[PDB]
């Protein structure tokens, strides 16, 4: 009872690149670029196709930085984030009718407007440490519980 889905965040030295959705899942929020993996598709082609879909932007090398397991109480399906990193890309962000790229200085990232567990997991994303997380949500805005811890292996 659990679906696969990629999470993936442009990360460079002094920024971060995030997505503000416009409708949808996640709209109103400013989100990395991800969704479900299909039929026949390697989790890491997933999340390289999901790149190009909503940021236009060409990923060459993608790193393995966690992995969290999201439930919202009440959905029968579990959300299994694969969650990857990069730093090497191609391409310049494109606004498109469902999302607005934009680049955040790393002391300006924008938690307020940003789902609630990534205050979480930024900070050992932006130090690069890899993790095993699981959030349990009411709606969209109430962590109930959590669990996150640092591992060797994603
Ligand atoms: C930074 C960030 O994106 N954080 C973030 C947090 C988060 C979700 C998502 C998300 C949003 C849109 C699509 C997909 C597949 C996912 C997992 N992203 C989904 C549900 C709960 N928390």
Redesign the pocket.
């Known amino acids: 009872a659990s679906r696969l889905?990629?999470?993936v965040?442009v990360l460079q030295p002094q920024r971060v690149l995030?997505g503000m959705?416009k409708r949808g899942?996640?709209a109103g929020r400013?989100?990395?670029?991800?969704?479900?993996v299909q039929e026949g598709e390697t989790i890491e082609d997933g999340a390289r196709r999901?790149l190009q879909e909503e940021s236009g932007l060409t990923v060459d090398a993608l790193h393995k930085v966690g992995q969290?397991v999201?439930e919202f109480v009440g959905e029968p399906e579990l959300?299994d984030?694969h969650v990857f990193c990069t730093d090497s890309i191609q391409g310049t962000p494109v606004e498109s009718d469902e999302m607005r790229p934009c680049w955040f200085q790393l002391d300006q990232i924008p938690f307020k407007d940003?789902?609630?567990?990534?205050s979480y997991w930024?900070p050992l994303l932006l130090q690069k440490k890899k993790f095993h997380g699981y959030?349990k949500?009411q709606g969209?805005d109430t962590i109930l519980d959590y669990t996150l811890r640092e591992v060797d292996t994603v």
């Open positions: 889905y990629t999470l965040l995030l959705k899942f996640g400013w989100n990395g670029f991800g969704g479900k999901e969290i999201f959300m984030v940003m789902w609630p567990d990534d930024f959030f949500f969209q």
